[PDB]
Scaffold this active site. Structure first.
Site: not given
Lengths: 166, 166, 166, 166
Positions: A9-14, A42, A76
């Site tokens: 998820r592109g939240e922290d490690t992105r 979506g 996912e």
């Protein structure tokens, strides 16, 4: 086309870690499809995501604080695990900024979210239980734990991943 | 007469950032002498560090929030500044999560660290004054920053610096 | 005869760590002279110890809680450092079960012992100050720090030591 | 159809003892499959462990103070005992800092750990009873001990076991 589609998820490690992994894999010559949009539309998966999942030789999942905090992330993960069951996708768990023991028991901050996710939305779905069982089954497959195997490195884990890939 | 050099604070860069930068520099083909591998057991530390700094060309020091804390790092910065004053060693700044204005006035975290050393070595050794002046000059010296220039990807900044070296 | 004489007080590490080092070095074929008697007579050094120190190609010192708690240990460290100054003995500091930072400042439990050692016995000798300066100078030479370099290994440090020796 | 196997508790043996034993076994020329290197990323963990245990000959489990804590380790002990019951796998005990009498009665630290699990899996799964019986039988089974047999050098015990294998 894409060989291994890393899913996180592109939240922290992105910003730093997953970005480093994407840059290293792209530079090394292995074709990979990643998080297409930071504003991804979506919580489900469109044609692009499904095709990438089906046509991926392997996959990479990095477990962190938010790695399941989104319903999209859990869905996912469910699709990826079902792919591993029915198809030949190689799943390599990556434990970054998370305790593997707590994740195995489905406990921690993710447990707080699950209790928050234990409302009528999942009571009309029971998908929380399915997601927890899927996470437990996925944790049965060994992977790489940077905070434990090396406990002080970030490039070494990338080197190990590259050694596994190519 | 060497190629490049590296400088970082072990508290916050020795794990994620400095290692990635070192890997990028080594892969790119430019030799680097970090204070983690360029050290033989028998020889001294201060002497070896001084010799390596004297024989290196380009130095990149990433100033962190607690940069002033490491007295050895401050001494290394002073020596690098003196070498750049006498010789013409390549100077390059790196600044992440520490805005150049904050360091230039020696304010904020730098102010607190100096206040802790306000009665320690400012007047008792007159080297804290030299270090403060050198830090102010280096802050006045333009370099590579990421707080607002890039602000979205550390690896992007690392690649930018590697491409910008030559 | 003896090539490298490891020096550590037979107090704590004499059971597992230093024993492992002695066994590995003896097995690997490098001749070494070690702590002759667990009931060693005299806090000074007899003919055997002096001859071993003089005729040693190198030396190994492991710093732990008791590594200076004995006056014999401090005297041996002083003699070894003076040998390194005047002779060609290679000194490789080994930091096991001790924080290198505290040892550098001569602080910690060793500081408590030094304050206890700051009585009239050393006031009539001042050897505490000499020992502290010697320890500080010795800490200026880099070595191996198992609790930091690997932080979770014991055989890896032995492998590194063997690689250095042979 | 392999050579040997190893079993330890990661809390207290994965750092000092088990590593030294593995190094000694590898150097001696007998292949060993520890649960740290004999694991491919793709394959499962429980399945791989069961297969490795089935195909190995000699197993050496070092029972520690918190041995009962690791549920996975207890399950591995149960499976090893069952294999020794059906087939004739070589059985060898290792016991350091845990006297055989204490473990045989499942007392002391084992008693506390079982009391924590007294209402967990003794009656709810009937596998805690099987594990307790298997531990009692293995304790009744003679092996290699170090609390009073050697009591002076762990490496001496490791060498004794390595020589005593064959």
């Amino acid at each position: 086309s894409y060989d291994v589609f890393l899913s996180f998820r592109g939240e922290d490690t992105r910003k730093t870690f997953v970005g480093h992994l994407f840059n290293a894999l792209i530079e090394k010559g292995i074709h990979t499809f990643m998080d297409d949009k930071e504003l991804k539309r979506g919580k489900s998966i469109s044609s692009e995501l499904m095709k990438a999942i089906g046509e991926s030789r392997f996959a990479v999942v990095v477990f962190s604080k938010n790695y399941a905090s989104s319903t999209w992330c859990l869905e996912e993960l469910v699709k990826i695990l079902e792919i591993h069951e029915k198809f030949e996708l190689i799943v390599v768990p990556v434990f970054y900024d998370v305790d593997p023991s707590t994740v195995r028991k489905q406990n921690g901050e993710y447990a707080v979210c699950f209790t928050k996710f234990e409302a009528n939305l999942v009571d009309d779905r029971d998908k929380v239980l399915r997601w927890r069982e899927a996470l437990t089954k996925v944790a049965n497959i060994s992977g790489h734990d940077l905070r434990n195997t090396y406990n002080g490195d970030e490039s070494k884990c990338i080197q190990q991943i590259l050694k596994d890939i190519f």
